[PDB]
Design a protein around this nucleic acid. Structure first.
Lengths: 46, 86, 77, 91, 61
RNA sequence: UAAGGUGAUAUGAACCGUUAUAACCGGCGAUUUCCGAAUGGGGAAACCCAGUGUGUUUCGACACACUAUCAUUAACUGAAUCCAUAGGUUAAUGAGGCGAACCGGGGGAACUGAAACAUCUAAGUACCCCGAGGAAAAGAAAUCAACCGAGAUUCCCCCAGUAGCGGCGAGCGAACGGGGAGCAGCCCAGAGCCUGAAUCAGUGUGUGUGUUAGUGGAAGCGUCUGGAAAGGCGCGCGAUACAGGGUGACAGCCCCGUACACAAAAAUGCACAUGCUGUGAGCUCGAUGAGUAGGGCGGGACACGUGGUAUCCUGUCUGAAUAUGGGGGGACCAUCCUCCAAGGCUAAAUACUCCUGACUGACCGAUAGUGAACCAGUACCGUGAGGGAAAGGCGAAAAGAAC
RNA sequence: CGAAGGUGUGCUGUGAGGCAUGCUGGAGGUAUCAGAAGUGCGAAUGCUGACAUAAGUAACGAUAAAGCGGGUGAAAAGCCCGCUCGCCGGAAGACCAAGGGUUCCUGUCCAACGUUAAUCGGGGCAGGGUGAGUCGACCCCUAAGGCGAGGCCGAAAGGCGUAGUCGAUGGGAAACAGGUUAAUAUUCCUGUACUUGGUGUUACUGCGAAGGGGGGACGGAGAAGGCUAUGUUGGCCGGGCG
RNA sequence: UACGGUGCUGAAGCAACAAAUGCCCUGCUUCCAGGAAAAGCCUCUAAGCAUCAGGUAACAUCAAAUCGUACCCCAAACCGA
């Protein structure tokens, strides 16, 4: 059966990547939250 | 012109392996580790100057870093015209 | 936005109260209208978005001094 | 600001070697010293090295009073000089 | 080592810099090739390039 | 400031230094890749693609700078359109983003309690957003009082769970007045006289104090058990230091210190003294903040739910007097009391802790205390926001066991 | 010259308990009288870690399929090699994209991993391997869409959108056959090519837009014809004579 | 010969028939549901440039960077612990 995760690097970066986070203030708050917590990997952008 | 300093920076070390040897003795080509940002042109000029040999062409490939912590480095296939280098 | 160029009236919030005093958060809006004012000194019509009280203030003070106020605080007209 | 240096003939205060005399061969940064021929680690067969010992455990040897001594610091000729405390004699 | 560099002029500070870089290249090539047991020359030459262009920077105003 | 070093790992290897230019620590510099406000344009972050100059060139090329947007200011030129404007262009100057709480605004719940629920409560709380500063806000009476008076705000203790408010239910809840902390007031709406006339910041100094390296410090041995003494035992000594921490068991005298006395090339802070710089005094006559006060309507805020509702605010519509004037004194009116709105500014006492240093706990001691003592926001999980561990201890010394 | 803790044993008190000292341990512990508690567990379908039980029970993942000989090793049903036998064959073969990320190739090893053993492995460890003007990306251009100077709006945050700028899943220039490595090949090598610019030189000349017009540049079904890949047969050539 | 494999030499190398769902063909025919866009490209000029610049042809020379290239890929390398 087809499962839910069908990976696509382009779609991943467009949907959750660093510049997508930076696009809106709500994303920048996601980034601020993740820095405040000290995440080693700040976004999906690899 | 590519100036002296960059040439002094672009050549890291001669790559030594079975492929590198057989390349030297069959294609008259030498294999080098070069700075990861070095260019066909920069490698060409640097080899011609620092090694005082004449080069036909340069082929470059970046070797991806192996899990451990190996950094990505660029390998250069330098095809000499007729000078014996080393 | 719905702000009067002259007075600075904005939408304000308040309650709407039924007969049983049920309260519903609501807004009161300024009575804004966009109207062209003859500026005699500049020989041009300036369009301002003013409340009706804005026009009354224009009537007392005159458009020249009101425009002076707008420049002073940097409102662009 | 040391009170025990390399060239220094010193006596041991604690640890199977009380009273033995020797020269400080090396001074480890962890506050331990290698002293000439005191803390011999004998393992197997042949001669082996001297294990480290705390500097706190050795005292400078006065060698005139023939007894251990404490060291002090003064400024003779505008220069830090070490001196034996129980004698006031510059080292 | 920086003193005798200080009385040296900008012109000869560049010649020395080039000389140091050629030496750095040579030492790198020996070290990579397996000889050059005097492995400290590498740090020495990096340090010498550092002071040479430190001086050479501070001459330029 | 040094006889030792080259961060740990960490062995090694190669070395470097020994009064002085080894290392190390402080001040001041230089360099500082790419991404990221990211800003030369783009982009799926850490990449792609430039233009314009200025040089260089070995003619293949190369280097280095600049170039985002906005606001303001100036210059230039400049449409309909005639002047003009709108626009355009070019500089200069700022701003942008981030950061824990605190603080001021603009928005604004619900669960809940009322033993149901709709008024009410929760609660102007959570949350969202915007803006500042070391605090912020507020602040110099159109204030209370009561016929005596007090005298700007903020904070604390009272008043007082009082007076009230309240489907007069749940609940909510003041003042006046007193004790304190702290505590100076000013300025324009304007001109004369006077005329830097004290002045509050800016800077350059000079001095005194901090601060960012450091310096010296005061004194103990014998014997016994033990693997080791720091324990016991004997006899001493220092002490403005018997704070602590180590050291092989339990050390005032072994070490690091401790009390105490000192130090600063330089760079900073903080007082003063100056020099100067924008600034203004004093004086005398003026002036005294209008779509405002107030009212009608709808709301909101005051403990006060519209109630007999004062007072404040403003969405909407109106609309004065103006110092022989007006506001307030809990409907309202008279009286006599008090103050001057419709412009500002302002220290202190007050709040808070991302951080830094010291020091302390009838605080914890690895299922505890931080989620995390251990390379933890890690492994890991999720599509992503987000969730989220488990895991310390050989010995005094690796002497970590040759054969 | 033996602290707490642990494990025994004796004695004692109405109990909760206390006390003594064998052993282990190896460094702390505290009568007394006061004071403060994160002060006492068997249960909460409690919480966390350990370890039971069923039980050596079920199972060991397509009923395509195995059998010998030799090798190697400590050991081989499973590894290698050989010979057979079975199975797929529009796939269970080959080649990619997406995705993954070094799994690739070689040498060692056998702890764990692999549902068994393993000498084997996509496992561990070490060394290597990805070579381009022509293939792709980047790049020129655009679609859906996104963003968007100004702008028009909206308590704020923001929404929409013009010039523009991005955005392929689409349109824009060009290399093929042989040979090669343990692992790369339209990339290396060999042969034979081709494309697009710049720069000169020579000849000859109207060149020059953000503008105009062509072109790119297009549906579904169906029906031929002409072909080729490809097969089959003859011939040919090399071998055969069971 | 390492028994893996490597080197060396090399004959014929044609014809007929049958052929795709591939090519001609984005063609053709028909149909109604009436079937992207822009650039490269080609031509025309405008402002301008003017014995210039450009264009066009020949010929020479040079430049074509940077990055992906291993391996799996209907699967034991992806998505399903």
């Amino acid at each position: 059966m087809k499962r839910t995760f069908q990976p696509s690097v382009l779609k991943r970066n467009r949907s959750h990547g660093f510049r997508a986070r930076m696009a809106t203030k709500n994303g920048r708050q996601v980034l601020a939250r993740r820095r405040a917590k000290g995440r080693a990997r700040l976004t999906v952008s690899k | 012109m590519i100036r002296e300093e960059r040439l002094l920076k672009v050549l890291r070390a001669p790559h030594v392996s079975e492929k590198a040897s057989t390349a030297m003795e069959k294609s008259n080509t030498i294999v080098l580790k070069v700075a990861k940002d070095a260019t066909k042109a920069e490698i060409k000029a640097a080899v011609q100057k620092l090694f005082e040999v004449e080069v036909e062409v340069v082929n470059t490939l970046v070797v991806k870093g192996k899990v451990k912590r190996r950094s990505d480095w660029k390998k250069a296939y330098v095809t000499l015209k007729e000078g014996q280098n080393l | 936005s719905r702000v009067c160029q002259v007075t600075g009236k904005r939408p304000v919030t308040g309650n709407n109260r039924s007969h049983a005093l049920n309260a519903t958060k609501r807004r009161f809006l300024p009575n804004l209208h966009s109207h062209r004012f003859w500026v005699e000194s500049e020989k041009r019509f300036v369009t301002l978005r003013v409340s009706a009280k804005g026009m009354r203030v224009i009537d007392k003070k005159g458009i020249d001094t009101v425009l002076a106020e707008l420049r002073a605080r940097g409102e662009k007209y | 600001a040391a009170k025990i240096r390399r060239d220094d003939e010193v006596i041991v205060l604690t640890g199977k070697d009380k009273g033995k005399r020797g020269k400080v061969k090396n001074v480890l940064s962890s506050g331990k010293v290698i002293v000439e021929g005191i803390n011999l680690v004998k393992k197997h067969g042949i001669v082996e090295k001297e294990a480290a010992i705390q500097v706190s455990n050795v005292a400078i040897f006065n060698a005139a009073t023939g007894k251990a001594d404490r060291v002090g610091f003064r400024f003779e000729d505008g220069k830090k000089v070490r001196f034996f405390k129980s004698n006031s004699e510059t080292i | 080592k920086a003193k005798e560099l200080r009385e040296k002029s900008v012109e000869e500070l560049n010649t020395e810099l080039l000389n140091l870089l050629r030496e750095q290249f040579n030492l790198r090539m020996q070290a990579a090739s397996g000889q050059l047991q005097q492995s400290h020359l590498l740090k020495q030459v990096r340090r010498d390039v550092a002071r040479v262009k430190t001086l050479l920077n501070e001459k330029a105003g």
